Amino acid sequence: GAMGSMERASLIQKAKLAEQAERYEDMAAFMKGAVEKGEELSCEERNLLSVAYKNVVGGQRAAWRVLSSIEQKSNEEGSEEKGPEVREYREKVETELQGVCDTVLGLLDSHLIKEAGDAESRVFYLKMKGDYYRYLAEVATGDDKKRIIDSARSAYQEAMDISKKEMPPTNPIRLGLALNFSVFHYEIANSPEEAISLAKTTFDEAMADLHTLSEDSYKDSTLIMQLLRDNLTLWT
Amino acid sequence: GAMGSMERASLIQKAKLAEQAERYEDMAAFMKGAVEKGEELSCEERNLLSVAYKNVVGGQRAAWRVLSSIEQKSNEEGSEEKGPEVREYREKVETELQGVCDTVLGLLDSHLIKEAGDAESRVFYLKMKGDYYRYLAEVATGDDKKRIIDSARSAYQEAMDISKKEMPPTNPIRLGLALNFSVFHYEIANSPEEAISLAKTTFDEAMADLHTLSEDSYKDSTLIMQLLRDNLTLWT
Amino acid sequence: FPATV
Amino acid sequence: FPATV
Ligand SMILES: *CC(=O)NCC1CCN(C(=O)C2(Oc3ccc(Cl)cc3)CC2)CC1
Ligand SMILES: *CC(=O)NCC1CCN(C(=O)C2(Oc3ccc(Cl)cc3)CC2)CC1
Ligand SMILES: [Mg+2]
Ligand SMILES: [Mg+2]
Ligand SMILES: [Mg+2]
Ligand SMILES: [Mg+2]
Ligand SMILES: [Mg+2]
Ligand SMILES: [Mg+2]
Question: For residues B174 and B168, is the Cβ–Cβ distance under 8 A?
Answer: yes
Q: At what angle do helices A119-139 and A145-166 cross, to 10 degrees?
A: 160
Report yes or no on B2 lying in a domain: no
From the list A61, A178, A191, A58, the residue with the least C-alpha distance to A130 is A178
Considering the domain boundaries, does residue B134 fall inside one? yes
Residues of B in contact with A63 (CB under 8 A): 21-23
Touch between B and A (at least 3 CB pairs under 8 Å): yes
Q: What secondary structure does DSSP assign to A216-231, as a single string? A: HHHHHHHHHHHHHHHH
State the resolution, in angstroms. 1.4
Q: Where are the alpha helices (DSSP H) in chain A?
A: 8-20, 24-35, 43-74, 85-107, 113-115, 119-139, 145-166, 172-183, 192-207, 215-235
Ligand 1 touching residue A15 (CB < 6 A): no
Ligand nearest to the CA of B9: 6
Give the distance (Å) from ligand 6 centre to CA of residue B8.
Answer: 6
CA dist A208 → A159, A164, A174, A226 (Å):
22, 15, 15, 15
Q: Is the separation of the CB atoms in A129 and A108 below 8 Å?
A: yes
Q: Give the integer Cα–Cα distance in Å for A65 and A71.
A: 10
Cβ contacts of D3 on chain B, cutoff 8 Å: 179, 183, 227, 230-231
Taking the C-alpha atoms of residue A202 and residue A164, their distance in angstroms, rounded to an integer, is 10
Indicate whether B54 belongs to any domain: yes
Alpha helices (H) in B140-171, listed in sequence order: 145-166
From CA B181, how far away is CA B159, in angstroms rounded?
10
Structurally, how many domains does chain A consist of?
Answer: 1
Neighbours of B140 (CB within 10 A): 18
Specify the residue with its C-alpha closest to ligand 1, atom 24.
A172
Q: How far is CA B101 from CA A158, B56, B61, in A?
A: 49, 10, 11
Contacts 24+ apart (CB under 8 A), A65-73: A66/B20, A66/B21, A66/B22, A67/A93, A67/B17, A67/B20, A67/B21, A70/B17, A70/B20
Among protein residues, the one with the nearest Cα to ligand 2's atom 7 is B47
The answer to whether position B200 is within a domain reads yes
Position A104, amino acid: V
Distances (CA, A) of A106 to A4, A65, A98, A102, C4: 17, 25, 12, 6, 22
Is residue A3 a part of any domain in this protein? no
58-117 of B, contacting D, C-beta below 8 A: none
For chains A and B, CB pairs below 8 A equal 58
Indicate yes or no: CB of B67 within 8 angstroms of CB of A21.
Answer: yes
- What is the number of the ligand closest to the CA of B194? 8
In sequence order, what are the residues at sequence separation of 6 or more whose Cβ sits closer than 8 angstroms to the Cβ of residue B199?
Answer: B178, B179, B182, B228, B231, B232, B235
DSSP string for A42-88: PHHHHHHHHHHHHHHHHHHHHHHHHHHHHHHHHTSTTPPP--SHHHH
Element (H, E) at B201: helix B192-207
**Contacts of residue B13, Cβ cutoff 8 Å, sequence gap at least 6:** A82, A83, A85
Helix (H, G, I), strand (E, B) or coil at A22: coil
Q: Give me the domain span that covers residue B167.
A: 8-235
CB contact B183 to D (< 8 Å): yes
Q: Which of B86, B172, B82 is nearest to B127 (CA)?
A: B172
Q: Determine contact, residues A97/A60, Cβ cutoff 8 Å.
A: yes
CATH number of the domain encompassing residue B62? 1.20.190.20
Does residue A1 lie within any of the structural domains? no
- Is A69 a member of any domain? yes
> Measured between CB atoms, which of B10, B22, B66 is closest to A63?
B22
Q: How far is residue B136 from each of residues B24, B131, B158, measured CA to CA in Å? A: 20, 9, 19
Q: Cβ(A49)–Cβ(A127) under 8 Å?
A: no
Taking alpha carbons only, the member of A4, A84, A14 closest to residue A48 is: A14
Closest residue of chain B to A9, computed from CA coordinates: B85
Hey, how many other C-beta atoms are within 10 angstroms of the C-beta on A213? 16
Biggest distance spanned by C-alpha atoms of chain C? 13
Q: In angstroms, how far is CA B39 from the centroid of its own chain?
A: 22
Q: Note whether A17 and B86 are within 8 A (CB).
A: yes
Q: Which residues of C touch A179 (CB under 8 A)?
A: 3-5
Question: Is residue A227 exposed (0-12), middle (13-18) or buried (19+ Cβ within 10 Å)?
Answer: buried
Nearest CA among A214, D5, A21 for reference residue B85: A21
Strand locations in chain B (E): none
Q: Does a structural domain hold residue A124? A: yes
